[PDB]
Amino acid sequence: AMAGVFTYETEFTSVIPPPRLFKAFILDADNLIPKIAPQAVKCAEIIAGAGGVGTIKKITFGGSVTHKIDGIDKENFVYSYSLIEGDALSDKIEKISYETKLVSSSDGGSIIKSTSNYHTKGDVEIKEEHVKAGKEKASHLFKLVEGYLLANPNEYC
């Protein structure tokens, strides 16, 4: 049965510049996300690793997923991870690999460049509705982080 990759690319915009945005939303995600969205996470636990590349994290929602860290680039503001266990995975979708890149905008903020790679087996049936519902949920989480950082200008400086 046919192996393939379905790639979906999207961009979000922030008034926050890449260094502060990467420090708060990516590097302190385990602490910042439950502070801003308490109803979103029940408990996030490290299975293996020290917090860098190769770390295995279990995540429970207020639903259970297992992520593996693939890449962290503290200078170029690039973060990579993989969904290696969850309800989204099946015989059709064997894995989901993500990449987030923070680029500086003309305004002085960020362009958040997100890539989703669905690793597929056999016939490919991917619904626009499901992809778009996940985009809206990601967009909302990013806007809560943005709000919190604008309200707390000394934090993650």
Q: What CATH number corresponds to the domain at position 67?
A: 3.30.530.20
Q: What is the CA radius of gyration of the chain?
A: 16
Nearest of 120, 112, 122 to residue 96 by alpha carbon: 120
Locate 84 and state its tokens. Answer: 């290696």
Q: How far apart are CA 6 and CA 127, in angstroms?
A: 12
Angle at 95 between CA 92 and CA 98, to 5 degrees: 130
Is there a contact between 100 and 14 (Cβ–Cβ < 8 Å)?
no
Q: Residue 153: give the domain boundaries.
A: 1-157
Resolution to one decimal, Å: 2.2
Number of domains in the chain: 1
For residue 121, what are the CA distances in angstroms to 1, 104, 148? Answer: 6, 37, 41
Asked if 119 and 94 touch (Cβ cutoff 8 Å), the reply is yes
Q: What is the DSSP letter of 24?
A: I
| Strands lying side by side in the sheet with 64-73 | 3-14, 110-121, 93-104, 78-85, 64-73, 56-61, 41-48
